[PDB]
Amino acid sequence: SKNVVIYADGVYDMLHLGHMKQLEQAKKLFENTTLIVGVTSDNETKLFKGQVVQTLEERTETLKHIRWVDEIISPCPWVVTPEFLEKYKIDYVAHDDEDIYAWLKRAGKFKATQRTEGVSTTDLIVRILKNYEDY
Amino acid sequence: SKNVVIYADGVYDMLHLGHMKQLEQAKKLFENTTLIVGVTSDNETKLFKGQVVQTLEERTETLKHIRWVDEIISPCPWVVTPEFLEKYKIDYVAHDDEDIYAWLKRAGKFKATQRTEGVSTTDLIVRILKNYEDY
Numbered sequence: 001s002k003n004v005v006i007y008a009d010g011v012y013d014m015l016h017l018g019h020m021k022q023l024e025q026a027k028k029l030f031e032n033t034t035l036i037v038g039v040t041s042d043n044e045t046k047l048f049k050g051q052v053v054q055t056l057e058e059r060t061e062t063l064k065h066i067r068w069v070d071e072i073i074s075p076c077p078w079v080v081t082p083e084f085l086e087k088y089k090i091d092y093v094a095h096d097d098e099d100i101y102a103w104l105k106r107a108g109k110f111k112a113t114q115r116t117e118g119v120s121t122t123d124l125i126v127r128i129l130k131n132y133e134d135y
Numbered sequence: 136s137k138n139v140v141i142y143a144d145g146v147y148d149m150l151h152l153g154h155m156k157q158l159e160q161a162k163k164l165f166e167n168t169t170l171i172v173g174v175t176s177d178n179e180t181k182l183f184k185g186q187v188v189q190t191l192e193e194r195t196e197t198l199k200h201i202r203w204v205d206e207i208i209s210p211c212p213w214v215v216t217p218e219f220l221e222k223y224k225i226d227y228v229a230h231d232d233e234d235i236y237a238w239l240k241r242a243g244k245f246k247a248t249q250r251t252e253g254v255s256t257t258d259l260i261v262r263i264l265k266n267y268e269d270y
């Protein structure tokens with residue numbers, strides 16, 4: 001019955017049904033939740049992961065439309081810290097999958113969510129291209 | 136103060152920020168609304184408008200995640216009729232722009248919403264392609 005604060009982070013570039021279902025899963029981990037979503041910065045995403053198609057402001061403006069999202073931290077830190085969870089009063093971190101998150105699991109704050117295959121924005125474009133026979 | 140029922144329809148293929156902002160605008164036409172969204176069928180869209188990338192079930196499953204959407208009619212009729220508005224107790228139709236909708240305007244039920252340029256799913260893919268210098 002008590003409200004529980006859930007945190008999920010990510011790039012959310014070219015937002016698709018796969019992202020949305022993962023956000024839904026985080027939102028519904030418990031009966032009464034606040035879902036905070038962290039959106040990674042342009043510079044850190046590009047440095048550590050890869051080039052982003054959409055700027056931070058665009059990625060965040062799109063997430064704002066998703067039913068499950070209660071609060072957005074934009075930009076969020078690239079690495080989650082215990083101090084960050086205390087500052088935002090976060091009870092659990094929802095995420096995929098030396099295990100950079102061993103400390104979240106040891107703390108009881110790790111909640112796994114699943115990715116959906118085949119539904120990404122690039123997947124849709126691949127379906128378009130497959131309409132043109134190569135020969 | 137009284138709740139007002141708003142109807143918007145469309146294909147909602149490869150849902151993007153442009154769709155989301157138009158749905159937000161329809162939802163916020165009045166202080167207290169129910170937003171019903173109609174999603175066109177595969178066959179009728181292909182016959183009258185063009186080939187859809189995503190099947191009806193996929194397009195609807197994606198709209199379900201949008202904050203502004205209260206009810207979805209999937210599939211919806213291709214042409215809105217007065218009987219349809221009475222059946223679903225629809226007060227206003229939100230839409231773009233011999234004027235097929237003269238009768239909605241004459242009835243006081245036409246509410247214009249605006250499209251946003253530059254934010255479509257294909258626009259994003261064009262931005263990716265523009266990263267590869269032609270030479």
Ligand SMILES: Cc1cc(CN)no1
Nearest residue numbers: 009010011077078079
């Ligand atoms: C925080 C945060 C999220 C991601 C997504 N790979 N990286 O850092």
Ligand SMILES: Cc1cc(CN)no1
Nearest residue numbers: 004091092107108109
């Ligand atoms: C509340 C609450 C948080 C946890 C995990 N640290 N258990 O209960």
Ligand SMILES: Cc1cc(CN)no1
Nearest residue numbers: 144145146212213214
């Ligand atoms: C109804 C309905 C919506 C559309 C979108 N062009 N066509 O019919």
Ligand SMILES: Cc1cc(CN)no1
Nearest residue numbers: 139226227242243244
């Ligand atoms: C309520 C309501 C609907 C209209 C338009 N027919 N005016 O008030």
